[PDB]
Design a protein around this ligand. Structure first.
Ligand SMILES: [Ca+2]
Ligand SMILES: [Ca+2]
Ligand SMILES: [Ca+2]
Ligand SMILES: [Cl-]
Ligand SMILES: [Cl-]
Ligand SMILES: [Fe+2]
Length: 681
């Protein structure tokens, strides 16, 4: 016989423990034991429990099987979250370590030692079980679709229909649910307080964030009205993704030197500043055709509980102090007397302010639906699903992606009801709410390309990556630093397990992984551009590029466009998401009163703040970038790669803080200690 010393580490998360009867069957080269009881004592969350069991000497241990009887009559939560099992056999000179970090329901098969690619040499029984795991994954994790024009999502009616491995932790479920309750209370209390207020000032909106715990007054609250800070936010606000270098005015945006001459201040005319790379532009043309709440359909000319959006163009200028200044706005796409060019030098100041608000409403709806919901959450969710469908838990790239894919399946399943469903949050707080929001995301998705998720390439393509021409762009600076740190780390992980490109080509799981997304995830359906998802991987560098794009997006990109929302939307006039009247068809009409009647109502503004409160709440159990304390790595070289990655992030963090000390408005959304590994809220 053999004596087996068995140590089981139960995860610390809530309900990780169990009182089910647990047995373990040990398999090795010489045969296998029966199921042996692990009976003495409890399995509480966070516990490390030891057992001594005796049975057939299996020789070199090759795998183990945990079995749970699923509890008895009085068992409240039999499911068991196991970090790892450690076994020592009295006949083997070796310590066997079996990482898990998954929920144990009834049966769990675990392998000892380092991650492997499917063709790496292992006992036949290990390969069989690996294949069986993947077959089961295909049954549990299934594609579903909002429509032909949306990226694939996980099939699940509600959150609690999800496999437990991809549900929120109970801590995050509580963080979320309590945040919704608090929101309701703060809205109710605020509603009582402001119930009979005469709203006749921009500064009335300040009251709406006062009784909220937001981590501080929105940092734009005292400066939203200043052109410099309005411009600033196209670099450092919630939507830093659409500004591009302007190398020629669009034909439908006939800005002349005469329009903007009073704004230039380096001694040169508009044409020269364009050539010098100091002129930038945003074009919201994708919003043409958008259907907003109550019926309005946006046209190239503008328009012919009723809400409105716009598809503006706006021109910006990097002045001699390095400030990005708004110098011209055209509210909709087709130029003319009824859709003129507005500038800071409007004779009627209220007309310039109103133009900025129209630009704001377009940005808000673009940001929330395209930049945030579609291009982080819904599109990366396809990759998270494919990870579970196609990569075995023993696969090194499963281990890599596990901390980064956490959350997105859970929050998106919750969101398909609560956020974009009928009567949902969007219906209440965005101009495009009421149904047009889904059509808009569909429209945006048809243009989505995986190459968009490559930060250096995208910044280059936009012409915004030259700090000498475009200074004070901290999303860029911090994002590029983080990108390089993630890319370097991922490259080192790949080199440990993939020794050459042939190793990549032969890995049927990673091949199945990217193919599943290519064919069933980001489907190139009628009317779609190519989505840039490869059908296969041919090299280590190509694998690195996709994984970096993905991990950066799950963590950093989502953080930059989500946790920035309190500063951005907290003071509503800084970024309205609803407007209540159509755009003007001539100059001279705007007054403070007509503007206030056009801006969101008290209740619409309050709801936007409530939503922002919920979407930006960090959970008490959040794990931030590079915190891999709950990962399943065993390989010493992999642990070393992780050490180097974490030390690099620490250096990046110090540099960002030092940078921030000299800024009027610190840029903090890309501090590693504030970036969740995943997209979970
Ligand atoms: Ca439990
Ligand atoms: Ca014990
Ligand atoms: Ca370490
Ligand atoms: Cl036995
Ligand atoms: Cl490993
Ligand atoms: Fe989010």
């Amino acid at each position: 016989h053999a004596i087996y010393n068995v140590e089981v580490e139960t995860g610390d998360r809530e309900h990780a423990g169990t009182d089910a009867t647990i047995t373990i069957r040990i398999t090795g080269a010489k045969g296998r034991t029966d199921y042996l009881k692990l009976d003495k004592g409890s399995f509480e969350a966070g516990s490390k429990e030891q057992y001594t069991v005796q049975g057939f000497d299996v020789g070199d241990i090759q795998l183990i099987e945990l079995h749970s009887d699923g509890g008895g009559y009085w068992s409240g939560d039999p499911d068991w979250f196991v970090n790892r099992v450690i076994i020592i056999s009295s006949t083997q000179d070796r310590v066997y370590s079996f990482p898990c970090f998954r929920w144990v329901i009834k049966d769990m098969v675990l392998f000892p030692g380092e991650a492997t690619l499917p063709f790496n040499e292992v006992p036949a029984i290990v390969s069989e079980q690996r294949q069986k795991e993947l077959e089961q994954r295909k049954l549990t994790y299934q594609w579903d679709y909002v429509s032909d024009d949306m990226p694939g999502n996980i099939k699940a009616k509600t959150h609690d229909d999800l496999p437990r491995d991809v549900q929120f932790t109970d801590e995050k479920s509580r963080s979320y649910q309590e945040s919704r309750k608090a929101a309701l209370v703060n809205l109710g209390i605020g509603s009582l307080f402001t119930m009979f207020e005469n709203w006749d000032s921009y500064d009335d909106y300040h009251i709406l964030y006062r009784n909220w715990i937001l981590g501080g007054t929105p940092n734009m609250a005292d400066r939203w009205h200043e052109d410099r800070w309005f411009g600033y936010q196209f670099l450092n606000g919630a939507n830093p993704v659409i500004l591009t270098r302007c190398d020629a005015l669009p034909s439908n945006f006939p800005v002349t030197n005469e329009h903007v001459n009073a704004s230039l201040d380096r001694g040169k005319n508009l044409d020269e500043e364009i050539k010098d790379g100091h002129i930038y532009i945003v074009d919201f043309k994708v919003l043409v055709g958008a259907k907003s709440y109550g019926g309005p359909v946006l046209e190239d000319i503008g328009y012919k509980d009723i809400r409105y959006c716009a598809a503006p163009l706006a021109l910006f200028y990097v002045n001699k102090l390095g400030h990005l200044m708004p110098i011209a706005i055209q509210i909709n796409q087709e130029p003319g007397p009824e859709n003129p060019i507005w500038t800071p030098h409007e004779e009627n100041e209220h007309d310039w302010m109103m133009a900025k608000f129209w630009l704001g409403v377009a940005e808000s709806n673009f940001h929330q639906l395209n930049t945030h919901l579609l291009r982080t959450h819904l599109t990366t969710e396809s990759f998270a699903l494919s990870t579970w469908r196609n990569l075995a838990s023993a696969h090194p790239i499963f281990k890599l992606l596990q901390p980064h894919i956490y959350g997105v399946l859970a929050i998106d399943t919750i969101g398909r009801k609560e956020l974009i469903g009928s009567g949902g949050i969007v219906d209440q707080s965005l101009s495009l709410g009421g149904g047009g929001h889904v059509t808009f995301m569909e429209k945006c998705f048809k243009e989505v390309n995986l190459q968009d998720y490559h930060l250096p390439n995208a910044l280059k393509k936009r012409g915004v990556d030259d700090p000498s021409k475009l200074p004070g762009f901290y999303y860029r600076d911090d994002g590029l630093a983080l990108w390089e740190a993630i890319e370097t780390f991922i490259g080192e992980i790949i080199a440990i397990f993939y020794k050459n490109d042939d190793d990549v080509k032969r890995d049927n799981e990673i091949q199945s992984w990217i193919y599943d997304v290519h064919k069933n995830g980001w489907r190139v359906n009628p009317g779609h551009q190519d989505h840039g998802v490869p059908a296969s991987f041919e090299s280590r560098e190509q694998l690195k590029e996709v994984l970096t794009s993905l991990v950066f997006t799950f963590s950093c990109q989502h953080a930059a466009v989500n946790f920035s929302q309190k500063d951005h939307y907290g003071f509503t006039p800084n970024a309205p998401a609803i407007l209540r009247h159509p755009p003007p068809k001539k100059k001279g009409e705007a007054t403070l009163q007509s503007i206030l009647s056009t801006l969101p109502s008290k209740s619409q503004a309050a709801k936007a703040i409530a939503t922002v409160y919920i979407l930006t709440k960090f959970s008490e159990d959040e794990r931030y970038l590079g915190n891999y304390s709950a990962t399943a790595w065993e390989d010493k070289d992999a642990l070393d790669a992780i050490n180097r990655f974490q030390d690099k992030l620490e250096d990046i963090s110090k540099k960002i803080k030092q940078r921030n000390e000299n800024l009027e408005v610190p840029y903090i959304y890309l501090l590693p200690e504030r970036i969740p590994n995943g997209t979970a809220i």
